[PDB]
C-alpha cells in the first residue's frame, strides 16, 4: 500500500551535484498535467548538508515564471527515505541510483498515501538515457501511475523544460 523499492547503501554524498528530471510520473493526472501543477518540479541539483540532510534546489511554474526554489530534505533512520517540511509529512524515498548516471525517487504522503504519489527519473547529463528510463518503468510497473511525462535534451537545458 506504499512504495516498496528503496536504495540500500545510499550514500547521500555521492548523489550530490547536478541532476536533470528526464521523466516524471504521478498517480493522478492532475499532479503533472499542466506546467503549474504542484509536483511538476524540475530538479537543478542536490546539496547534501553537513549532517546528512539533503538540500534540493529545483524549478517550478508558480503563476507566470520559472522560479528557482530551495527545499530541505531531512534524513530519517532509513538512509533512502527523507522528509520534507511539513503540513502533513511529505516523504522522499530514493528507489535506485548508480550515483554517476541516474537516480529514481518517489514522493508520497504520510497519509499514507491512499493513494497519491509523484516519481521522477533524475539523470546527470541532458540526454535520453534509455537504460535508466527502462529502470524507471520497471519500478513504476509496481505502482498506480496515471500520467507519465518524459523530455528531450533541448528541454533538459531550458528552465522549466521549455
Ligand atoms: C533524493 C531527493 C530527490 C529530490 C526530491 C525533491 C522533491 C520535493 C518537492 C516538494 C514539492 C515542492 C512544491 C510544494 O511544496 O508545493
Curated annotation (Swiss-Prot):
Q: Name one GO molecular function term.
A: retinol binding
What compartments host this protein?
A: Secreted
Q: Per its UniProt record, what PROSITE patterns does this chain match?
A: LIPOCALIN
This chain's protein is named Beta-lactoglobulin
Membrane spanning stretches: none
- Keyword Disulfide bond part of the UniProt annotation: yes
Q: Which UniProt keywords apply?
A: Allergen, Disulfide bond, Milk protein, Retinol-binding, Secreted, Signal, Transport
InterPro entries attached to this UniProt entry? Blactoglobulin, Calycin, Lipocalin, Lipocalin_CS, Lipocln_cytosolic_FA-bd_dom
SUPFAM superfamilies reported in the protein's UniProt record: Lipocalins (SSF50814)
Tissue-level expression: Synthesized in mammary gland and secreted in milk.
Query: Which Pfam family is one of those matched by this entry?
Result: Lipocalin
Biological function: Primary component of whey, it binds retinol and is probably involved in the transport of that molecule.
Modification after translation (UniProt): Alternate disulfide bonds occur in equal amounts in all variants examined.
> What Gene3D superfamilies does the entry give?
2.40.128.20
Q: Which GO terms describe its cellular component?
A: extracellular region
Per its UniProt entry, which superkingdom is the organism in? Eukaryota
According to the record's subunit comment, the protein's assembly and interactions are:
Under physiological conditions beta-lactoglobulin exists as an equilibrium mixture of monomeric and dimeric forms. Interaction with LMBR1L which mediates the endocytosis of LGB has been observed in PubMed:17991420, but not in PubMed:23964685.
Q: Which family does it belong to?
A: Belongs to the calycin superfamily. Lipocalin family.
Instruction: Supply the source organism for this entry.
Output: Bos taurus (Bovine)
Q: List the disulfide bonds.
A: 66-160, 106-119, 106-121
